[PDB]
């Protein structure tokens, strides 16, 4: 059906955003973890 | 020209292998780091 050029494109953005969020998670979660050692040094 | 279907494909494998190696690095480097807390020769 559409498993062609138009399809391979969607993947490119899929992986793209997937690699962005992945870092944003460890970055955002690091804020909640700071509570223990609230950045005051 | 070349910046088309055939091009977007190459990217898919680029990111693919790039995400594999990335993990293989932190995995392989972990062996060298063990020296401190691991059997030394």
Swiss-Prot record, chains A, B:
What protein is this chain from? Rab11 family-interacting protein 2
Q: What's the subunit arrangement here?
A: Homooligomerizes in a Rab11-independent manner. Forms a heterooligomeric complex with RAB11FIP4. Interacts with AP2A1, MYO5B, RAB25 and REPS1. Interacts with RAB11A and RAB11B (activated GTP-bound form). Interacts with NPC1L1. Interacts (via NPF motifs) with EHD1 and EHD3. Interacts with TICAM2; this interaction directs RAB11FIP2 to the phagosome. Interacts with RAB14 and RAB25 (GTP-bound forms).
Species this chain originates from: Homo sapiens (Human)
- Corresponding gene? RAB11FIP2
Q: Which residues form the FIP-RBD domain?
A: 2-41
Described purpose of this protein according to its UniProt entry: A Rab11 effector binding preferentially phosphatidylinositol 3,4,5-trisphosphate (PtdInsP3) and phosphatidic acid (PA) and acting in the regulation of the transport of vesicles from the endosomal recycling compartment (ERC) to the plasma membrane. Involved in insulin granule exocytosis. Also involved in receptor-mediated endocytosis and membrane trafficking of recycling endosomes, probably originating from clathrin-coated vesicles. Required in a complex with MYO5B and RAB11 for the transport of NPC1L1 to the plasma membrane. Also acts as a regulator of cell polarity.
Where does it localize?
Answer: Cell projection, Phagocytic cup; Cell membrane; Recycling endosome membrane
> Where does the source fall among the domains of life?
Eukaryota
Effect the entry attributes to changing residue 33 to E: Abolishes the interaction with RAB11A and the vesicular localization
């Amino acid at each position: 059906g559409s498993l062609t050029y138009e399809e391979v494109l969607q993947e490119l953005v899929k992986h793209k955003e997937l690699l962005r969020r992945k870092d944003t998670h460890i970055r955002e979660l690091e804020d909640y973890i700071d509570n223990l050692l609230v950045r005051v040094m």
